Structure formats: C-alpha cells, structure tokens
Amino acid sequence: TFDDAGANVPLITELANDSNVQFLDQDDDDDPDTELYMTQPFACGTAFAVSVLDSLMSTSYFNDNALTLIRTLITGGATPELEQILAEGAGMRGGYCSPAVLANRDRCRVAQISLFDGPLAQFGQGGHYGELFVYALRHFGILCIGLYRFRDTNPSSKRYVITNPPEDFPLLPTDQVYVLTYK
C-alpha cells in the first residue's frame, strides 16, 4: 500500500513454466489443463511465456514478409543493416545524423488511446466499433486493431484484449482501443 494502491500497479511477468500462470492472480477459477492463452492472466496481458512464440517457425515458413511485419513493430524498427553493424562487434555506433536518415523517424507505431474523452468519446458513449474504425481512419489516419476492455463493469482494474471486434460490436466509455498511428 502507498497511502503515505497495491494491485492497481501494472505488471508483466515472464514465466519459465506456463503452468505456473495459475498462481499469478485470485478468483481466476484455475484449471491445470487450459492452454496458457485461455488463462485470465494471459488474456489480461499480465503474463507472458516463450510457449506462445513457437508457431513463429511455421509463420516464418508460410509468409516470410509477415515475420518482418511483426518485427518492425516489436523491435521498434530494427533492420538487417543494424543487425549487421552489431555483428561487426564494434558495439552500437551512433552520433548526429543527416536529414535523409532522420526521415525514418516518421514511421508507424502501435499506440493505445481512450474513449473516455477527446474527439472519439462520442463512440464510447454507446456507439459501435465499426463507426469508430471508419471515423478514426478518415479524420486521423488512425487504424484501429482491437480493444482493451475492463473485465468487470460496475470494481477491479483488470482489462482484457479483444482483437479486431465485429463492426456492430457495442463500445463502452471506459474502453481503450489499440491503434496503428503515424504521429
């Protein structure tokens, strides 16, 4: 407690054994035989483990280009050039840079934004995800990819992921939306 808030602080835990996910939180209704991705701590983004990544073998085979899509995002924009400069053993070389290479700063990133206030709040006030998607893309170039919604609606702080909802999916004023964004 910090009364001088406890479970309100956001955690992400790397797990060595995916079965230990059941110990991370209370009132999960734990089972030993649910796969990690179904468990409440993973659905909330409070837990992670290596076992969710091993399908990247088969995705790297079936579409190489799609693995570069993930990495551009997940590394924040590492490149074969940067990987080679590090493999040259000299350490990460840097300094002041030209306007020509600084053009790479204007690139897309993943961001998370709230429907509680600002121009998009009109959709949190009883609109639908399809309305929000089209409006944000048209007015801002903001491309919505999913929701981060409170698990319970009334008292806990936990939220869960909803990848790419249907167009008629109802929104809440407390929702946050994951967005691809350019500034």
Next chain:
Amino acid sequence: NVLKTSTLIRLVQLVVSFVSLWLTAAGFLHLLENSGDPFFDFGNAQHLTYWECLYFLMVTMSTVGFGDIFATTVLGRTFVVIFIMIFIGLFASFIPEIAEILGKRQKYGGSYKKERGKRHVVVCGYITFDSVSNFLKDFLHKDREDVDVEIVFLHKGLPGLELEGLLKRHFTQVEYFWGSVMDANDLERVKIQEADACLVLANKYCQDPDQED
C-alpha cells in the same frame, strides 16, 4: 484418439500381439498334426482339436510341458522346436511387462467423502512414517478433549509399509490420498473448501532449508 497414454499403448500392443500370435500358432500346429506328414503319405497324423493345440502351445510356451498332449508328426515336432526357440522369449518378457504395467497404478486415488457434520484437517508437505507418527500421537492424544476431527493426508507418493500400517491403525479418523496441494484438482479431492485448517509440515533435516522453505 482413445488410446491416450504411452503405457496404455504399450499394454494393448503387448496383449493383442500375444493373443494374435498364440491363436495363429495354434492354427498352424492344428494344420500340421491333423494333416499328418507328407513324407509318410499322410499316414502319420493326430486328430487334435484346435483347442487342444491352443492349450498345448500355452503349456509349452510357459515351459510347464505336461506331455498329456504332444506333437508326433515330423512337421509338428519341427514346428514345436521353432515355436520353443521363439515363444519362450515372448512369454518370459511379455508376462512380466504386463504385470509391471498392471502394478504401476495409483492405490490412493479417489476423493474425500465429507461426512455430514464432522470437521477435517488437511495435512501435507513432509509426510513420512517419522513425521506422521510424531504428529498423530500428539494430535490424537487422550489428554486432549474428545473432538471428532478427521485427518486427511495429501502427498505425491505411495506410503511405505510402516506408514500404511499406521494409517490402518487409525482407519476411523485418518485418511490418505495420493496428490499435491500444487494441483487445484487434488485440493478439490481433499475437499479443502470446507476443511477446518491446512497444516504444511517441513522436512527439518533437508540438505538445504531454503529449498524446503
């Protein structure tokens, strides 16, 4: 998808391999003995039934060999020699591996049946004849007031014979289950939702007390 586990796969393979080879070899001997030998114009023959051949092969592959029934054609005898060299190896390896698989079964599975108005205490951690005997002789001691509390041991192991004797001496008020408090399914079996307390005993004589803690 029904044959789910490696031991059930091995079990069904052993049993059905044995039975199919035994039934096949019994038919083969039945053909040879009832045929009679071709070298003697089929005059040397025996009128065995298939069931007598099936019995005789069991009696020979087990190496009992009563000789109440035996082969008398030269083909049936040379078949019995080939059969002896092969099937003694099968019987002497298969029957112990069947007995091993049937022996490797949990004897303290199942679930605590909560009696209508009695209390129970779950006990776990370092459970052994030394820890349990010292615990029970203080917990169930006659100088305490008479209270009906059941003790429910939960441990990931089979009791040693000394502990199994001690559990049987307290059969009316002590119960034991295979399992671990690390599994929600085992905690449900011991009915811990409505236990009065859980006691976690420690190995005071472990090689390192931080791994034990």
